[PDB]
Write a protein that binds this ligand. Structure first.
Ligand SMILES: NC(=O)c1ccc[n+]([C@@H]2O[C@H](COP(=O)([O-])OP(=O)(O)OC[C@H]3O[C@@H](n4cnc5c(N)ncnc54)[C@H](OP(=O)(O)O)[C@@H]3O)[C@@H](O)[C@H]2O)c1
Ligand SMILES: NC(=O)c1ccc[n+]([C@@H]2O[C@H](COP(=O)([O-])OP(=O)(O)OC[C@H]3O[C@@H](n4cnc5c(N)ncnc54)[C@H](OP(=O)(O)O)[C@@H]3O)[C@@H](O)[C@H]2O)c1
Ligand SMILES: COc1cc(NCc2ccc3[nH+]c(N)nc(N)c3c2C)cc(OC)c1OC
Ligand SMILES: COc1cc(NCc2ccc3[nH+]c(N)nc(N)c3c2C)cc(OC)c1OC
Lengths: 507, 510
């Protein structure tokens, strides 16, 4: 069973090669926005120094020692490197990227072992380009632009500004005509803002510096407004406020709304993994691959530590669905089976189903490659005949593809959507699918459009959801591929990496 | 056949007698005063003429008003009394008078000498008169209904239930200020409470005119209409497609501007039928095709014999041969649409074959669930059958519908993969409007909302210029569906059973 698989084309990696790596920015400014004299840093505020070292050294996971394997990177202009006393460079615990057209890597080592320094002949884009390569992605966890006026200037305009994930700004409450170089965040809806709308995530109270001068200062974290996730958050808020009380099969309460639509850009490696509550990506990834393979044995997910189908695959449940002859974890002709073997007679999971039923995924892959204007390019799992033989009816039951300007868009129709767990999971799921299918057809990812039927929140989840509603959505992470694989069905979870995923903690 | 779906015994709890659409005609001073309770305080012959012309004239070329086709005017009894006996009734118009005391026979009598069977008393308010004028007796003859008022009648016209049938307001403003006027009329402004969710807009306004009553009395006319948000919602999509859509090309190689993924909603409440006003929808065709779908039919000759030729090209000997279907006779479309609805997965042979009990009866199951367990989330029927696809004349376009109950109302979602905004879409909106209305009747719920999901929404390149002319048009109100008779079985509904009332769409764009 190898000639029934999808063969990945020669143009597979170029579809999802990361052009630039995402980065955060860290700066100190005065009330006039000045950053320095182009030579040295004017003010002396030890509390900013501590903040700066912390924001740039600390890693996502707790108590993780920075090492070549996993550490942060700081990118800086050459003049900034010079402004640091030779004794204290390179900055410990981090990878020091230096932009210069006159100083090579080895040249930087001449002045003041181990490896923590790279020079780049180019600007911030080139640095982000290099950091996008395998040797740095995903070994480097977070990239920080620690700046220099010209570097900040490059960060705050296209193409780089669209990769800018957070601003960590310290404001020093002092002023002087001694500041030549300036740093200003573009205001919402201005030309300089290039479409971005910077939100304030946090602001500190005014603190006083123990520097002998009694200087005031404060910290702010700015983030680029995530309207896509706000779509979702709005819907949840509308459901709680205006939704109808309903009760599902068990008898559990639910707040419900009917008919809705959301969009998510998949462009430039962008992955719509929700940030206001961490999504279980590993399971998302494992299940989709399990779907694509037309797999119906749930143990294959259970084995890989994904238990999302554990309850629905138990003897207890299968019996309650009258499927008394199914082996435990054999779920019947669900999802993937309909995708790859529509209308094929089902017996047991371990049977051979090669070349049986309709192979919708393959058909679509073939159509996209030859006639991209086709309006019949859609698959479905909603098979009335198969339905009683399934452990569960499909929620996400239909998807349609669309091509424009060499970009693959995809719309998913979901009949019943749990806003709490299902919806975020399925958003990522169909993102991955569209990405993979785009790879298989030599196209770029476009948009994912989500259509909802009965969109619901669980009654007891209202209290938790209300707390999440008060969180400001953060920028989405990115998906990159460690390696490609000859066939579509051969792709493993470890073949792809989600980078710069910084969700909020739970509560 | 009793493989059919048996209709319920009663009308769904909360359902209402069909109400007629009406316009309101009024003359006010600047303070908003209309009369002294007894008479009009001012003398402006130009308003008199405007009133005669607006309430008398019909839509035609030079169509003389006759008992066969004419307008009706509804008035309070006091207003009738204010019109001097020798001018009753108002010529070329059905005179409907509201009174609990006076009867038809009371009204004629009180006339000077002479006949006038153009008078009818109504023992009730404006609601009763709008019900009456919806009778199978009146809907042929009565073309437009005018509320010529009385303070009390205007009051009733401006509140629910009546205000929702108000298609336009013709107001004359007389620039006199009389401290006399004790009766008032105020058009509620958009967003205010008295507007009760209606957004009133000025369609037209005359220049200020001077009356020739020898007092230089200033006056002016204006037409006020309620905003049709839902057709606006459609048109905005069309306009967004033309401005932002990508150039694409269909199977033949024809140019289209298109966008991917959009969603529209329409209210069906009390059998409101979203037939678009800015370009006439071929209702008869919509109706015949749907009942044809519901019955599980696949023989297009059934449709073309009823003078509905939409399936003609797709049913011909030439076309069926090209799709590889050398076995089907002409007009046999294969296991399409209705077949999948009523017999999902059944092996197909020919249109004339017996298919009872075969496949899955998706509609029958949905009807069943709605009646017993309406919070269900699996109440959806699909025509998209990957196995059956190659045996069909065309793959389904509207290919999935989901039902939803809330507040004893049946809502419904329609998924359409390919959407031509000019012809295919407004047709399909009506198709699923009707369906939801029928399924509501079949399960004893009252109609709710139609949600429409569009896949590839497009406009044809050649259709771009005509669309722009249509986009300039102002949407009128949606009509209503009125079932003039009933059936024992859902399948037994003929197109003749239902009447669309007050569908007055625009003429064709050049
Ligand atoms: N307040 C703060 O937080 C903060 C932080 C950092 C810096 N500053 C102040 O900013 C001032 C310096 O900023 P400024 O830009 O003059 O210097 P800044 O950019 O660090 O450094 C500029 C240098 O980086 C290298 N470089 C930059 N862009 C390049 C490109 N496109 N291609 C090749 N090389 C490139 C070039 O050096 P080569 O020609 O030698 O190759 C360029 O001269 C100092 O005051 C610094 O202290 C303030
Ligand atoms: N400026 C304009 O455009 C304009 C137009 C028309 C009239 N008007 C003014 O309107 C003034 C009078 O109006 P207004 O409201 O007092 O009277 P309006 O209703 O014309 O006349 C009162 C009549 O309404 C009838 N009516 C209303 N609701 C009814 C119901 N539910 N059932 C039975 N009968 C019902 C009553 O009949 P019964 O009491 O017999 O039961 C009553 O006789 C006139 O003086 C005239 O000047 C102005
Ligand atoms: C503390 O170690 C040192 C660091 C630096 N770097 C300059 C400097 C200072 C504060 C800063 N604060 C923020 N928020 N962001 C920066 N990018 C930043 C930089 C870039 C300069 C030093 O010499 C003055 C030094 O030794 C004191
Ligand atoms: C139609 O002819 C007549 C009508 C009326 N009805 C009062 C009256 C006057 C102006 C009016 N103007 C408008 N815009 N709409 C009306 N409803 C209206 C009415 C209702 C009173 C008459 O006696 C003067 C008369 O004879 C001229």
């Amino acid at each position: 069973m190898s000639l029934f698989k999808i063969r990945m084309p020669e143009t597979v990696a170029e579809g999802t090669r990361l052009a630039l790596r995402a980065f955060s920015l860290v700066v100190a400014v005065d009330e006039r926005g000045g950053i320095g004299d182009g030579r040295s840093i004017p003010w002396n505020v030890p509390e900013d120094m501590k903040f700066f070292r912390d924001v740039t050294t600390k890693l996502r996971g707790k108590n993780v020692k920075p090492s070549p394997a996993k550490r942060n990177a700081v990118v800086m202009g050459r003049k900034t490197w010079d402004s640091i006393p030779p004794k204290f460079r390179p900055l410990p615990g981090r990878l020091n990227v230096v932009l210069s057209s006159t100083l090579t890597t080895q040249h930087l080592l001449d002045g003041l072992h181990a490896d923590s320094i790279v020079a780049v002949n180019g600007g911030l884009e080139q640095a982000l380009q290099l950091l996008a390569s395998p040797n740095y992605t995903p070994s480097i966890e977070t990239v920080y632009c620690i700046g220099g006026g010209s570097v900040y200037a490059e960060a705050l305009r296209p193409p780089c500004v669209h990769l800018l994930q957070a601003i960590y700004r310290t404001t020093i409450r002092a002023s002087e005509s001694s500041c030549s170089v300036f740093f200003r965040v573009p205001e919402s809806g201005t030309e300089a803002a290039a479409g971005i709308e910077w939100q304030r995530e946090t602001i500190s109270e005014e603190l006083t510096s123990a520097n002998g001068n009694e200087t005031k200062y404060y910290f702010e974290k700015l983030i680029p407004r995530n309207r896509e996730e706000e779509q979702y958050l709005s819907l949840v808020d509308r459901i709680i406020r205006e939704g109808n009380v309903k009760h599902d099969r068990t008898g559990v309460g639910t707040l419900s709304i009917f008919g809705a639509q959301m969009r998510f850009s998949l462009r430039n490696n962008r992955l719509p993994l929700l940030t206001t509550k961490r999504v279980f990506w590993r399971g998302v990834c494992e299940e989709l691959l399990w779907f694509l393979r037309g797999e119906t044995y749930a143990k294959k997910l259970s084995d890989k530590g994904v238990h999302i189908w554990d309850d629905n695959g138990s003897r207890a449940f299968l019996d309650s669905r009258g499927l008394t002859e199914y082996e435990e974890m054999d779920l019947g002709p669900v999802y993937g089976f309909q995708w790859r073997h529509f209308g094929a007679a089902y017996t047991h999971h371990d049977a051979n189903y090669d070349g049986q039923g309709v192979d919708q995924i393959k058909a679509i892959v073939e159509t996209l490659k030859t006639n991209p204007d086709d309006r019949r390019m859609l698959f479905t799992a909603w098979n009335p005949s198969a339905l009683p033989r399934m452990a569960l009816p499909p929620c996400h039951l239909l998807a349609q593809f669309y091509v424009s300007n060499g970009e693959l868009s995809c719309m998913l129709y979901q009949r019943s959507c749990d806003m709490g767990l299902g919806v975020p999971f399925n958003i990522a799921s169909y993102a991955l699918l569209t990405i993979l299918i785009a790879k298989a057809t030599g196209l770029r990812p476009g948009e994912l459009v989500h259509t909802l039927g009965d969109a619901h929140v669980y009654s007891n989840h209202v209290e938790p959801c209300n707390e999440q509603l008060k969180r400001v959505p953060r920028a989405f992470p990115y998906l990159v591929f460690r390696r490609e694989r000859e066939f579509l069905e051969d792709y493993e979870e470890g073949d792809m990496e989600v980078i710069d995923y910084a969700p909020y903690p739970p509560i």
